[PDB]
Amino acid sequence: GSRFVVEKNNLKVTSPDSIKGIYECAIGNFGVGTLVGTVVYPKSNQKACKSYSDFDISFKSKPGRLPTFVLIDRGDCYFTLKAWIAQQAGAAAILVADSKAEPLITMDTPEEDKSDADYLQNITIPSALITKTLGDSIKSALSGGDMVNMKLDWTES
């Protein structure tokens, strides 16, 4: 089922030491250099299917701090909507953790209704799908108080 036909990229977790290393990810087929950021998992709206502004949540990093990569759960809405919504909230990149343990998948763009078509052309933030294992590892680091920093490389596209 061409289940290993994904365009994979590498990312690097640079901290904490417990989970530091190189991990495979799959860049979204939408949007699109190296970018270092720090990962945040929101306490609400964790699938990024509704506007973060309804929650008064912003991921805009303060001057002098690292850009925010928002960790989002797969499910309930299109991947492209998750990226758009994370982008509207000021995130510098989105990491979508797969909801099941499986080979990486490619986030594809849907065919939308006429009234919901124009946002597809306006997605700019880097978007990557990561495994449930890595998502779970990052969430565990964050819940214990660690800073999770990450370098994204999309030169491989």
Partner: peptide, 5 residues
């Protein structure tokens, strides 16, 4: 392996 959701 392409998925919309």
């Amino acid at each position: 392996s392409d998925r919309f959701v």
